[PDB]
Amino acid sequence: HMNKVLLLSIQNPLYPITVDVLYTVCNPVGKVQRIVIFKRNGIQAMVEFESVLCAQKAKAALNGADIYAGCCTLKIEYARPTRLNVIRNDNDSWDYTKPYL
């Protein structure tokens, strides 16, 4: 179901996957509000965008792309949660409306 939260699966994650990397990946194509990175079906992340349109733009532009040449291939689907909540801003979760510390 279309939604403003995307679920990213990072195939062949040869390099670190942190919120700063995913912000530089996603935000130029769709405005990001929150990012949560976790391990489940491999290295995965949910990214909450400002709107459904912004999430659709990010999904269209990034699905199947590699973050870095030859690795870190993105598989993107709509996430189940309609919103994300970030406990703290660190390397694995970030709310871009709120300060570090």
Place this chain on the structure above:
Amino acid sequence: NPNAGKVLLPTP
């Protein structure tokens, strides 16, 4: 797969 071969960032 229209983004096959797309690369987003310089390698670290």
